[PDB]
Design a protein around this ligand. Structure first.
Ligand code: MG
Ligand code: MG
Ligand code: MG
Ligand code: MG
Ligand code: MG
Ligand code: MG
Ligand code: MG
Ligand code: MG
Ligand code: MG
Ligand code: MG
Ligand code: MG
Ligand code: MG
Ligand code: MG
Ligand code: MG
Ligand code: MG
Ligand code: MG
Ligand code: MG
Ligand code: MG
Ligand code: MG
Ligand code: MG
Ligand code: MG
Ligand code: MG
Ligand code: MG
Ligand code: MG
Ligand code: MG
Ligand code: MG
Ligand code: MG
Ligand code: MG
Ligand code: MG
Ligand code: MG
Ligand code: MG
Ligand code: MG
Ligand code: MG
Ligand code: MG
Ligand code: MG
Ligand code: MG
Ligand code: ZN
Lengths: 96, 60, 147, 123, 74, 114
RNA sequence: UUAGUUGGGCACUCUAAAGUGACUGCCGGUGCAAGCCGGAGGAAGGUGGGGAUGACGUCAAAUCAUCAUGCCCCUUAUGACCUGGGCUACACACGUGCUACAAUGGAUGGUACAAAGGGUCGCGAAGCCGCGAGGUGGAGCCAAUCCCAUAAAACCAUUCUCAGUUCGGAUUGUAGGCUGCAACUCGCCUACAUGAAGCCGGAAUCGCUAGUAAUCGUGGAUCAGCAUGCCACGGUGAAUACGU
RNA sequence: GCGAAGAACCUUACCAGGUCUUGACAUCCUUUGACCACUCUGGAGACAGAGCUUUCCCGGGACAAAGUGACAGGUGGU
């Protein structure tokens, strides 16, 4: 009955990492609430190009935050022991 | 009269209102984005090289 | 367009008395996206034009067709390093486009209080071969008659 | 059935019945005042002769009042066709299974609107 | 303060006027009902324009009377 | 009729605005205190009611009396020596409204090009 | 159950990772071929719509006031500290916007449908005091959950009946609210009062080829506070292209 | 409706008045040690004068005060 939330900038790194713990969850327990998507945050920063005048030229950068959460349905003693023993790629967000 | 004033930005004034924000690499007064503390020209010049994570060019 | 011709659309048969001379003059009516304001008016004008005239609203609305459709549009032809008035024969484009423009462009001349009857009076007024919209058509052919 | 247009979506369940075209847990004439725009919704049921044979249930989210009218029309036109494949040979010609692809347009920097621009003066 | 829960003089103009020409330096310190009959000198960006606080001009910000831009015709 | 030539063909609430001091929110109440319905035509106002209005309208201020206070207060500023008075006499906006351009409600018409 | 509220289920939607789909592919005319004119099928047809991406180089084009730098000048002042002030001054001329000159409208009441974003020392609900801007109160939230946040144009009834007006709202007086040590020069907003030009704009000139122009609202960055501007998001939705 | 993605103060580069000199701000050194923060008077504050005062850590170590200079310091010019 836990809940883990994944918040990484690149969808490849997190969705691969979530595909690991979701596998370790099956070994620890059959009852697993697998990875599931949530809407992704986007933000935009419209910084201006020229060092001086010419107000009509800018350049827009963005910064997403892909999200995914994993939970537990009817966990066992293995869940508490076998969860914290993993290190994920630097960028993946862990919060149980 | 420029490098004098960065000390004015840094030191705690006698009224919260006096206190403003300036870029944390080149002390440019205007256009400082608070999530980064960088001015407009610092912010772009690092984004290309790639010091700021997550940020990337946005076609859409 | 500097490359050939193009063909237009102006086609969406209306709900009541389905036609495209009634979804047109209902699109040359609105201002700044006011389809709803015009559509009710363009059906209330039929309501008064179907009572005070008696005949079918559609036939009465199309009765003013041959009385507003232009026949000769004086063209501005470039001759001798200037522009003159060379009359020509208008096509179907400038017939219905001009023709339905003549009414609404002359909706300040019915002199009523509301556009519900003002558009209803003008259609009947031209349907009587009178009024200004038909006179405007006769006025255009007059300047085309000189050349 | 399922039909989109602009930012509005309408999901349609169609079952045989009297013909009351209910919409979003309310009567349709309550939910749409100007009945004259609501007659086109019968085009997916007048082009094929099934006008008052099924009771139309609808669910509505988003867009504007005219915004659903294009989506509910399509949203049923993909269900009456699924009832019997005989309906496709005419519902796929009038322009009903097609999905209107026009949508609003991004606003590009340096321009007041999407395609507009500042006012221009030479000297 | 335009709010009815306040009425402030600078810090000292009231103190110097309390005992007591007067030259209160800056500005901004609207003449309360305890200073009629004690001329002050409110500075003006240059020089000290002399104004005599009467009973009529009570409540107004001290600065108002001394103008700042010299415009003697076009 | 009352004080001045209030419009005849208008309503009660609309026409009673025709004084310098009786407007819309004040009129909607001074017509209410009299008790006459706001839709009552002014040309048919009750003689049992036109005597009632003068009771209320005697309480609040009116054209010829109050308007002296508008000039009295706007003349005290000039003599007091206040900066607001200067901009009254000269013809410039009293508030912080900028006089560099586009401020002509006070400075008469657009003067001749000079 | 007053409410998607509750059990319960991921059916439909929708969110988001991996895939399919459109290429002149097929048919007719034409062409030698490239291609061009039309038809089926398909959600979509001729680079479907739109972004990002800007070759060789031109203007001794802009910036020594973002940062850096060649050389020069000041170096008890052309450096440094504060308080006040100017950056908002006005007899005028020009550029870009906002609001109107009314009946496709105003006033009054009812009432319906969004998209995209922001929130921790931050968003701040309900009730309570208020015409009032607001104040007290502290629920829920490190958020597809709670909050900012009731969107307005539309629509339905009554009134107004073509007047510088039941349009318009500048200008000014009084009386007030917010932040901030402080709103006089010089902030934003509210009530009452006041109520000005304007009755569709001369020669000339500007933008846009479709969800476009026009028009009505919302969010963010900067930000103790202050935007008719800027960057984004949606709702209603047109007119014409013979031709160079 | 241009740099300015916020000119009441601050930002501010400008003016007047009032004040400082190795300097408000860095690196080389020495004598002190962790230096500050706090209250009272005057002033417009910038700053002066009084007091408790800052109890360092492991000969060395970070940070600071005070003493003359090398220097700093220029949003000064092209
Ligand atoms: Mg570019
Ligand atoms: Mg500030
Ligand atoms: Mg099919
Ligand atoms: Mg363009
Ligand atoms: Mg002048
Ligand atoms: Mg101002
Ligand atoms: Mg002018
Ligand atoms: Mg499934
Ligand atoms: Mg084809
Ligand atoms: Mg394309
Ligand atoms: Mg493109
Ligand atoms: Mg581009
Ligand atoms: Mg060259
Ligand atoms: Mg060059
Ligand atoms: Mg040049
Ligand atoms: Mg310079
Ligand atoms: Mg550099
Ligand atoms: Mg650098
Ligand atoms: Mg300026
Ligand atoms: Mg200004
Ligand atoms: Mg102009
Ligand atoms: Mg109109
Ligand atoms: Mg209005
Ligand atoms: Mg959203
Ligand atoms: Mg509104
Ligand atoms: Mg409106
Ligand atoms: Mg009005
Ligand atoms: Mg006035
Ligand atoms: Mg006035
Ligand atoms: Mg008047
Ligand atoms: Mg008025
Ligand atoms: Mg006036
Ligand atoms: Mg084009
Ligand atoms: Mg942001
Ligand atoms: Mg501006
Ligand atoms: Mg400028
Ligand atoms: Zn910088």
């Amino acid at each position: 009955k836990i809940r883990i939330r994944l918040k990484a900038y690149d969808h490849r790194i997190l969705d691969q990492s979530a595909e690991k713990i979701v596998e370790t969850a099956k070994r620890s327990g059959a009852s697993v609430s697998g990875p599931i998507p949530l809407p992704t945050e986007k933000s935009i920063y419209t910084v201006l190009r020229a060092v001086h005048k010419y107000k009509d030229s800018r350049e827009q950068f963005e910064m997403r935050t892909h999200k995914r959460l994993i939970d537990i349905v009817n966990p066992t003693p293995q869940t508490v022991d076998s969860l914290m023993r993993l290190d994920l790629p630097s960028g993946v967000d862990i919060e149980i | 009269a420029k490098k004098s004033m960065i000390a004015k930005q840094k030191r705690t004034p006698k009224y919260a209102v006096q206190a403003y924000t300036r870029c944390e690499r080149c002390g440019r007064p205007h256009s400082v984005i608070r999530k980064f503390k960088l001015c407009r020209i610092c912010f772009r010049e690092l984004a290309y090289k790639g010091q700021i994570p997550g940020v990337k060019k946005a076609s859409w | 367009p500097r490359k050939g011709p193009v063909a237009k659309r102006d086609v969406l048969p209306d709900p009541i008395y389905n036609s495209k001379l009634v979804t047109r003059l209902i699109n040359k009516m609105m201002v700044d996206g006011k389809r709803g304001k015009s559509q009710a008016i363009l059906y209330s004008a039929f309501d008064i034009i179907a009572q005070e005239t008696g005949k079918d609203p559609m036939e009465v609305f199309e009765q003013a067709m041959k009385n507003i459709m232009p026949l000769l549009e004086v063209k501005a032809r470039r001759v001798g390093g200037a522009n003159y008035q060379v009359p020509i024969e208008v096509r179907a484009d400038r017939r219905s486009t001009l023709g339905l423009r003549w009414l609404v462009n002359y909706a300040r001349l019915r002199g009523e209080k509301t556009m519900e009857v003002r558009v209803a009076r003008e259609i009947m007024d031209a349907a009587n071969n009178t009024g200004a919209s038909v006179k405007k058509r006769e006025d255009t052919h007059k300047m085309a008659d000189a050349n | 059935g399922t039909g989109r247009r602009k930012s509005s979506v309408a999901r349609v369940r169609l079952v045989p019945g009297d013909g009351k075209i209910v919409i979003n847990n309310r009567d349709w004439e309550d939910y749409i005042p100007f009945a004259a725009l609501r007659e086109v919704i019968k085009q997916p049921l007048v082009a094929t002769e099934t006008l008052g044979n099924y009771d139309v249930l609808v669910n509505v989210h988003g867009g504007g009042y005219t915004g659903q009218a294009g989506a509910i029309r399509h949203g049923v036109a993909r269900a009456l066709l699924q009832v019997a494949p005989e309906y496709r040979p005419a519902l796929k010609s009038a322009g009903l299974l097609t999905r209107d692809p026009r949508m609003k347009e991004r606003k590009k920097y340096g321009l007041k609107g999407a395609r507009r621009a500042p006012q221009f003066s030479k000297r | 303060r335009s709010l009815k829960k306040g009425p402030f003089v600078d810090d000292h103009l009231m103190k110097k006027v309390e005992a007591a020409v007067i030259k209160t330096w800056s500005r901004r310190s609207t003449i309360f009902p305890t200073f009629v009959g004690q001329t002050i000198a409110v500075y003006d960006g240059r020089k000290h324009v002399p104004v005599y606080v009467q009973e009529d001009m009570v409540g107004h910000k001290l600065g108002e009377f001394a103008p700042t831009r010299t415009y003697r015709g076009h | 009729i009352a004080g001045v030539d209030v419009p005849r063909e208008k309503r009660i609430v609309i026409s009673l605005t025709y004084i310098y001091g009786i407007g819309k929110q004040t009129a909607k109440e001074v017509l209410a205190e009299a008790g006459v319905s706001e839709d009552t035509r002014t040309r048919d106002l009750t003689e049992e009611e036109l005597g009632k209005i003068r009771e209320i309208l005697d309480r609040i201020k009116v054209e010829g009396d109050l308007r002296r206070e508008v000039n009295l207060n706007i003349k005290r500023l000039i003599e007091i020596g206040s900066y607001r008075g200067m901009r009254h006499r000269r013809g410039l906006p009293v508030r912080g409204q900028n006089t560099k351009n586009n401020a002509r409600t006070r400075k008469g018409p657009s003067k001749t090009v000079a």
